[PDB]
Amino acid sequence: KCPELLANYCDMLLRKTPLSKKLTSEEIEAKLKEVLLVLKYVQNKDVFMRYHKAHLTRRLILDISADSEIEENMVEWLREVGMPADYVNKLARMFQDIKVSEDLNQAFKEMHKNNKLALPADSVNIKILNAGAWSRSSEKVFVSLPTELEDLIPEVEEFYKKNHSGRKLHWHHLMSNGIITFKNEVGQYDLEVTTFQLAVLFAWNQRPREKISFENLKLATELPDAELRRTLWSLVAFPKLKRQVLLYEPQVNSPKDFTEGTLFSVNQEFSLIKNAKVQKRGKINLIGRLQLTGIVQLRILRTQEAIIQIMKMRKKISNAQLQTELVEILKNMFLPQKKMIKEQIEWLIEHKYIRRDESDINTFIYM
Amino acid sequence: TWELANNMQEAQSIDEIYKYDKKQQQEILAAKPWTKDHHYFKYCKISALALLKMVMHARSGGNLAVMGLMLGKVDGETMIIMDSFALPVEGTETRVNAQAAAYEYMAAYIENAKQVGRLENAIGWYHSHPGYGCWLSGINVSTQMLNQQFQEPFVA
């Protein structure tokens, strides 16, 4: 089915994700409701849910949402249309964390305003979100941040420790964004870049334009090898760009791979001009749509007769007791998840092998 | 003298129940007394040998479940069972299905017993419940439905 493509339509309606500037009025929201109806009719909703979660994370972590009330009501609309409760709970937790992060940033700006840090207190924003819902990966990659940001992370860590002692903050450099100022001769144009792109651009800043090799860049940025190449793809193969900021590639080739020992160098007189006419006060966004962050059928047959065995052993049981006995029995086999047990639960009740008690919503009766 | 009665060859009604009155069995089968009232036979008498054979089959099954047949007759209001006969059935301790092996086994064993000199017929079946008391489940209830409604003399 369409799945992800349909999710793209949502990205074109709920917020200005990229080319979604075509917004007319609130009636489009009604059209979104129709899309929700499609989500009811179609199958394979896991991909759609994952795409929607990724789009929401990309929109919220960048503050590019066209509307706020529509985004808040989208959770209720999705819950009404029918979706797993885990996704709804994760969305609610993400929204609550985003709400709390505004107050945290305001408190940080209001309190730390005498140390002067490095940049002005009105130019640094801190957004701390819970890692149990807003993230899934747990891998840390060095970025070798510049000296300007080397005095801001410790201050944020100290403030978080003072206010909410008991939790550890693990900074995620992939989702961070910022604006840098260039001085490429004719026109000084602001550029929006992530942490890795900022490090790559600032590596060739301690000695004018000059020229550096791939090995030197890798040894300076200290990035995770192959991922560094991906960052280069953002600075050498920017789509719909008249002239890239880092207009170099040595032996041509392609930004995908085969970098080898290419000598990339920044173009001092690069023609990075908005509308190709006088880049006096231009601004270029280079982040783009990055948003960086036992076969099943033979295995599902294992647990159903296990549930039926638990039921045939004892007629009366509760939900918690059923879960405890099921996980007690199935330890020798694979470790059960939560989604599989739930799926088996309504597969059993839909086959009317068990009866849901009317007085008690959790009590089950064998047949 | 010390035991008084003793026993050379004499017996009583205790030894009399082990026989096969062909005319009596034929006439009770033809008359069909239990087909007219629901509250028929309430007394079931099973010999020792069948009991120990069932127990050994259940123990040899182990934590799993076993299943077999039984042989006997009916006499008036009472039911008589005096033989146990196991089956080569396999399955999980929560469900057992009689494959073609049991279907080819019961007939073969019945023919072998007839060749031996046995004259009784199938009377019912025994199933072992490993732990969950002694009560018929839904599938057991349906099977007993069909068995007692097609093969009127029966018992589980």
Residue in chain B lying closest to A307 (CA): B94
Paired tokens of A136: 């899934």
Edge-to-edge order in the sheet of strand A283-285: A177-181, A190-194, A283-285
**Residue A264 and residue A251 in contact, taking contact as beta carbons nearer than 8 Å:** no
Contact: B132, A308; criterion CB under 8 Å? no
**Residue B100 and residue B119 in contact, taking contact as beta carbons nearer than 8 Å:** no
Comparing CA positions, the residue from A314, A315, A322 lying closest to residue A345 is: A322
Amino acid at B152: E
C-alpha gyration radius of chain A = 26
Contact: B93, A309; criterion CB under 8 Å? yes
Measured between CB atoms, which of A309, A314, A367 is closest to B94?
A309
Residues comprising chain A, all counted: 367
Residues comprising chain B, all counted: 156
Edge-to-edge order in the sheet of strand B67-75: B43-46, B78-86, B67-75, B121-127
**Residue A167 and residue A260 in contact, taking contact as beta carbons nearer than 8 Å:** no
Residue in chain A lying closest to B91 (CA): A305
Tell how strand B67-75 and strand A354-356 pair up.
unpaired
**Residue B154 and residue B143 in contact, taking contact as beta carbons nearer than 8 Å:** no
Contact: A305, B95; criterion CB under 8 Å? yes
Comparing CA positions, the residue from A130, A264, A145 lying closest to residue A194 is: A145
Dist CA A42 CA A2 (whole Å):
9
Contact: A367, B92; criterion CB under 8 Å? no
User: Which chain A residues are closer than 8 Å to B93 by Cβ?
Assistant: 309
- What is the dihedral angle through the alpha carbons of A19, A22, A28, A31, rounded to the nearest 10 degrees? -50
Dist CA A108 CA A105 (whole Å):
5
b/e map A331-348, b = 16+ CB within 10 Å: eeeeebeeeebeebbeeb
Interface of B with A (CB under 8 A): 92-95, 131-132, 137-138
- What is the dihedral angle through the alpha carbons of A147, A150, A152, A158, rounded to the nearest 10 degrees? -160
Comparing CA positions, the residue from B48, B35, B34 lying closest to residue B81 is: B48
Dist CA A242 CA A245 (whole Å):
10
**Residue A297 and residue A178 in contact, taking contact as beta carbons nearer than 8 Å:** no
Dist CA A154 CA A162 (whole Å):
12
Comparing CA positions, the residue from B16, B36, B128, B18 lying closest to residue B80 is: B18
Dist CA A237 CA A290 (whole Å):
13
Q: Which residue has the tokens 């709970």?
A: A89
- What is the dihedral angle through the alpha carbons of B75, B79, B82, B88, rounded to the nearest 10 degrees? 130
**Residue A244 and residue A227 in contact, taking contact as beta carbons nearer than 8 Å:** no
Measured between CB atoms, which of A308, A314, A367 is closest to B94?
A308
Q: Is A166 left (phi over 0), alpha (psi -120 to 50) or beta?
A: left
Contact: B94, A367; criterion CB under 8 Å? no
**Chain interruptions in chain A, by residue before each (C–N > 2.5 Å):** 293
User: Which chain B residues are closer than 8 Å to A305 by Cβ?
Assistant: 92, 94-95
Angle between helices A214-221 and A195-203 (to 10 degrees): 120
Which resolution, in Å, applies to this structure?
A: 3.5
Q: How far is A308 from chain B (nearest CA, A)?
A: 8
DSSP single-letter state for residue B155: B
**Residue A120 and residue A113 in contact, taking contact as beta carbons nearer than 8 Å:** no
Amino acid at A115: N
Contact: B95, A314; criterion CB under 8 Å? no
Distance of CA A82 to the CA centre of its chain: 23
Convert chain A into a string of H (helix), E (strand) and C (coil): CCCHHHHHHHHHHCCCCCCCCCCCCCHHHHHHHHHHHHHHHCCCHHHHHHHHHHHHHHHHCCCCCCCCHHHHHHHHHHHHHCCCHHHHHHHHHHHHHHHHHHHHHHHHHHHCCCCCCCCCCCCCCCCCCCHHHHCCCCCCCCCCCCCCHHHCHHHHHHHHHHHCCCCCCCCCCCCCEEEEECCECCECCEEEEEHHHHHHHHHCCCCCCCCCCHHHHHHHHCCCCHHHHHHHHHHHCCCCCCCCCCCCCCCCCCCCCCCCCCCCCCCCCCCCCHHHCCCCCCEEECCCCCCCCCCHHHHHHHHHHHHHHHHHHCCEECHHHHHHHHHHHCCCCCCCCHHHHHHHHHHHHHCCCEEECCCCCCCEEEC
Contact: A308, B131; criterion CB under 8 Å? no
Residue in chain B lying closest to A309 (CA): B94
Paired tokens of A97: 């964390």
Dist CA A211 CA A333 (whole Å):
58
Q: How far is A328 from chain B (nearest CA, A)?
A: 17
Dist CA A42 CA A1 (whole Å):
8
User: Which chain A residues are closer than 8 Å to B95 by Cβ?
Assistant: 305, 308
Dist CA A20 CA A7 (whole Å):
13
**Residue B154 and residue B81 in contact, taking contact as beta carbons nearer than 8 Å:** no
CA distances from A33 to A11, A37, A74 (A): 14, 6, 9
